Ligand binder design. Structure first.
Ligand SMILES: [K+]
Ligand SMILES: [Mg+2]
Ligand SMILES: [Mg+2]
Ligand SMILES: [Mg+2]
Ligand SMILES: [Mg+2]
Ligand SMILES: [Mg+2]
Ligand SMILES: [Mg+2]
Ligand SMILES: [Mg+2]
Lengths: 55, 123, 171, 119
RNA sequence: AAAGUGUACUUUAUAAAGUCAUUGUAUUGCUUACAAAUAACUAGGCAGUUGGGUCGGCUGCUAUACUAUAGCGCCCCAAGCCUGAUAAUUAGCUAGGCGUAACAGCGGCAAGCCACAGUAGCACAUAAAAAUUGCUACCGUUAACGCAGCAGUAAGAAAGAUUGGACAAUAGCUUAAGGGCAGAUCCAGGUAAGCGCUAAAAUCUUUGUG
């Protein structure tokens, strides 16, 4: 669902502003976590390769 | 007996969940890696990773234990924490805090008494 | 369902096209109409013809030749409401507003004696034509005077005539 | 009257606006009332085809402009025809020519001869 | 794939995004072995039965392996296969659990696997799916229904709880406008497992008065 209004008043402006901030914050948060997961993923893969060679 | 699962789900997601292990009005939680669609306290798990005691002690703090190395391993594989687990990891500094959406609904005026008839009898 | 892209619209049109030519039906309908109900049917026929032409690709005033015939039938029948509706929605019916058409409609209403209808047609016509002839205005004024005399006994008619006279004077 | 399409009205789909205009409103500018007036959001109509059966609804094709710039590469049909709030936006040349006509229409509405809600 | 792509959809004088559709290096796996109650007043069992050959065994779209589960099915060919077999009685299994120095014996609690939803045969549903999906016949009440979902009623039995409150928390379904749904669950009521405390006052507890 979305919010739309024919009246160009303060209430309409507030809803648009709040939504923009939330979406921007969530997008930035997603990028940071994924980068951490990718970095950890490489580390564990390297350990497995070393263990396999030892065996 | 409770052998841990090894094969990953093919049609569902893995999540990090809280399991209720308390007593009457004395909650206690255990963190484990389980299939998304299951019973709350089901015995099917991939690993148990931590514990949490939400109530304050004489020192005024809550206590939380976690495996730092294994949390990263499962987060890399694709396990998705729930909303409350995100809060615990955010405060503990394992991952950045997750922003919450704005709230407009008038909050509940009876949250600790609405679901407890014993208090309402005295009220 | 209509295609999303405009480049595929030609194929959509050619498949099962609807009936488009209604000139023969309208000509027969105009002659056969002798009551108000038939006049309403003709108005619907005009609307369907104007809408149907888009399938062929024409966007002109299809109902530009039979307008005069429709006016004649309405005057003979004696009902002016169909003409009032036509001028109110002239574009929707595919009729191009022009001074000769306005004069013909006003004369028909004036002949019927409905000065109030004559004022309505002139007022609606003024919204399509920038300049209204002064002679036409005088004719409508005479029609209003005749209408007032004919129906002087009805207070509601007197109020309507007075209101229309004020509108004509203001505009 | 076609002059009644300038002010948006409740339960007024784009089909009613397009039909009650000269030449089916080809080459005109239309927009919804929920869009900000200064946002420069509008549709430019290039082709119109009526419904096969109803003959009272229209499928329109054209371009979509946001901030006075095209948003898509090729013409496409308007998918929001069925929504409400559409109104006519005459170009400056049309506005100048229609100045006296708008005044006449407003006077008639003020005096109660014309009821915009019915039309 | 916590991904990419779009002549697609929605919101914006503030825009980042999501929605819908589609896409994976072979595009969702079969087989074998061992163990697990009585039981001979059950001694013969099996003929698609044991093995071999051709053909079939579909839902495409890397290349070879000479066709790469199978008597799984048709036709043909050779006579083999099992023998505490075959037929019966009883029981859901694992395990926590209770007695015992142990060995053994028996099977209330948390959880895992399997089967079923009045009875039986079928269609979908393959890969994670039929209490609250269909078709047919039958049984019991009255064209319909089947509470072995929660509460509750009747009969039977020595003996089986309220026709309660709430989504505040945990888990789940949907949704980018921050909401909606819920007898899972969390709380209360009822019933002498068990565990803890009270059933007497004392300078109005000197952890006091000031
Ligand atoms: K059955
Ligand atoms: Mg049994
Ligand atoms: Mg059955
Ligand atoms: Mg199920
Ligand atoms: Mg039953
Ligand atoms: Mg029951
Ligand atoms: Mg929730
Ligand atoms: Mg007793």
């Amino acid at each position: 669902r979305v919010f739309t209004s024919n009246k160009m008043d303060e209430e309409r402006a507030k809803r648009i502003t709040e939504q923009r901030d939330f979406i921007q914050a969530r997008v930035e948060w997603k990028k940071a976590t994924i980068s951490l997961y990718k970095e950890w993923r490489r580390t564990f893969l390297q350990k497995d390769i070393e263990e396999q060679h030892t065996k | 007996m409770n052998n841990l699962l090894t094969q990953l789900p093919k049609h569902d997601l893995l999540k990090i969940k809280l399991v209720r292990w308390g007593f009457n009005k004395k909650p206690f939680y255990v963190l484990s890696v389980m299939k998304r669609r299951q019973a709350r306290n089901s015995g099917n798990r991939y690993e148990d990773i931590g514990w949490w005691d939400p109530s304050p002690h004489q020192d005024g703090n809550s206590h939380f234990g976690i495996k730092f190395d294994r949390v990263k391993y499962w987060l890399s594989q694709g396990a998705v924490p729930t909303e409350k687990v995100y809060g615990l990891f955010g405060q503990a500094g394992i991952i950045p805090q997750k922003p919450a959406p704005p709230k407009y609904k008038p909050a509940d005026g009876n949250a600790d008494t609405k679901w407890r008839p014993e208090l309402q009898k005295n009220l | 369902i209509a295609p999303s892209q405009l480049d595929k619209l030609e194929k959509f049109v050619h498949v099962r096209p609807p009936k488009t030519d209604y000139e023969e039906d309208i000509k027969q309908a105009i002659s056969s109409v002798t009551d108000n109900e038939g006049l309403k049917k003709c108005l619907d026929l005009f609307l369907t013809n104007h809408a149907a032409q888009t399938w062929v690709g024409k966007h002109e005033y299809a109902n530009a030749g039979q307008v005069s015939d429709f006016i004649k039938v309405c005057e003979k029948v004696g009902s002016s409401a169909p003409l009032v509706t036509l001028w109110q929605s002239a574009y929707r019916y595919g009729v191009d507003p022009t001074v000769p058409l306005l004069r013909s409609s006003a004369a028909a209403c004036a002949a019927l004696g409905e000065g109030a209808d004559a004022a309505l047609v002139l007022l609606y016509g003024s919204c399509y034509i920038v300049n209204v002839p002064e002679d036409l205005a005088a004719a409508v004024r005479t029609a209003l005077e005749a209408h007032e005399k004919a129906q002087e006994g009805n207070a509601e008619a007197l109020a309507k005539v007075q209101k229309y006279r004020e509108a004509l004077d203001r505009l | 009257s076609y002059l009644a399409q300038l002010v948006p009205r409740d339960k007024r789909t784009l089909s009613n606006v397009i039909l009650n205009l000269p030449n089916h409103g080809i080459g005109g500018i239309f927009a919804r009332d929920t869009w900000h007036p200064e946002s420069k959001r509008y549709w430019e109509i290039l082709e119109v085809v009526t419904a096969k059966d109803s003959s009272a609804k229209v499928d329109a094709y054209g371009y979509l402009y946001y901030q006075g710039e095209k948003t898509h590469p090729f013409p496409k049909r308007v998918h929001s025809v069925w929504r409400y709030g559409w109104y006519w936006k005459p170009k400056p040349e049309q506005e100048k020519l229609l100045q006296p006509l708008k005044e006449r229409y407003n006077t008639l509405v003020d005096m109660g001869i014309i009821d915009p809600s019915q039309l």
